[PDB]
Amino acid sequence: GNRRIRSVGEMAENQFRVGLVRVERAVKERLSLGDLDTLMPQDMINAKPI
Amino acid sequence: RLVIYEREAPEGTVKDIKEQEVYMGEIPLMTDNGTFVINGTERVIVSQLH
Amino acid sequence: ATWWIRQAITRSIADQARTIRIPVHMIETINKLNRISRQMLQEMGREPTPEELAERMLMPE
């Protein structure tokens, strides 16, 4: 009852989450200096990190 | 969705550009039999007990 | 001093920070490639082809 069972789905959920925190620093970081209408939600969020 | 709130609001946005489906990552897919193909080789993720 | 201090840091990092020393022009080239792969990673939806960065970049590619 104190022993819980994980499995692939849960593990991947955690891993994808980690991608989102390390892209988060970037998103805030860019939104730090950003020009108004030039950037879009692409130039910020990367692929390799997530 | 990127929203920018007017500086010294009442909070309202100058412009919000909605970036259509920005691509982040490729997440792996599970076979009909529950294995994954990582590099051309069938792999299982063992459930963990904690 | 900011210019001088900043000049010394970068010029030092470039010079002694690698196990195989590389000329300065080599370093700048590499960074230029990383930048394109950044935009081009998600811009392309997969990632730039090995010859993709070649045309964006001046050189023999």
From Swiss-Prot, chain A:
The UniProt Biotechnology section states that this protein is used in the following way, namely:
Co-administration of salinamide and rifampicin or salinamide and myxopyronin suppresses the emergence of resistance to both antibiotics.
Note the superkingdom of the native organism. Answer: Bacteria
Q: Which residues cross the membrane?
A: none
Post-translation changes: Acetylated on several lysine residues in the presence of glucose.
Q: Which family does it belong to?
A: Belongs to the RNA polymerase beta chain family.
Q: What does this protein do?
A: DNA-dependent RNA polymerase (RNAP) catalyzes the transcription of DNA into RNA using the four ribonucleoside triphosphates as substrates. Resistance to the antibiotics salinamide A, salinamide B, rifampicin, streptolydigin, CBR703, myxopyronin, and lipiarmycin can result from mutations in this protein.
Q: How does it assemble?
A: The RNAP catalytic core consists of 2 alpha, 1 beta, 1 beta' and 1 omega subunit. When a sigma factor is associated with the core the holoenzyme is formed, which can initiate transcription. The rRNA transcription and antitermination complex (rrnTAC) consists of RNAP, NusA, NusB, NusE (rpsJ), NusG, SubB, ribosomal protein S4, DNA and precursor rRNA; S4 is more flexible than other subunits. In pull-down experiments interacts with CedA. (Microbial infection) Interacts (via flap domain) with Escherichia phage lambda antitermination protein Q; this interaction renders bacterial RNAP resistant to transcription pausing and allows it to read through termination signals.
Name assigned to this protein: DNA-directed RNA polymerase subunit beta
Please name the source species. Answer: Escherichia coli (strain K12)
What gene is behind this protein? rpoB
UniProtKB/Swiss-Prot annotation, chain C:
Q: Where is the signal peptide?
A: none
Subcellular location field: Cytoplasm
Q: Organism's domain of life?
A: Bacteria
What is its quaternary makeup? Interacts transiently with the RNA polymerase catalytic core formed by RpoA, RpoB, RpoC and RpoZ (2 alpha, 1 beta, 1 beta' and 1 omega subunit) to form the RNA polymerase holoenzyme that can initiate transcription. Identified in a complex containing RpoD, the RNA polymerase subunits RpoA, RpoB and RpoZ, CRP and DNA. Interacts with Rsd; this prevents interaction with the RNA polymerase catalytic core and with promoter DNA, and as a consequence, promotes transcription from promoters that require alternative sigma factors. (Microbial infection) Interacts with Escherichia phage lambda antitermination protein Q.
> What's the stated role of this polypeptide?
Sigma factors are initiation factors that promote the attachment of RNA polymerase to specific initiation sites and are then released. This sigma factor is the primary sigma factor during exponential growth. Preferentially transcribes genes associated with fast growth, such as ribosomal operons, other protein-synthesis related genes, rRNA- and tRNA-encoding genes and prfB.
Query: Which family does the similarity line name?
Result: Belongs to the sigma-70 factor family. RpoD/SigA subfamily.
Q: Return the domain comment text from this UniProt entry.
A: Contains 4 domains, connected by flexible linkers. In the active conformation, the domains are in an extended conformation, each making extensive interactions with the RNA polymerase catalytic core.
Name this polypeptide is given: RNA polymerase sigma factor RpoD
Where in the full protein does the shown chain start and end, and how long is the full protein? 431 to 491 of 613
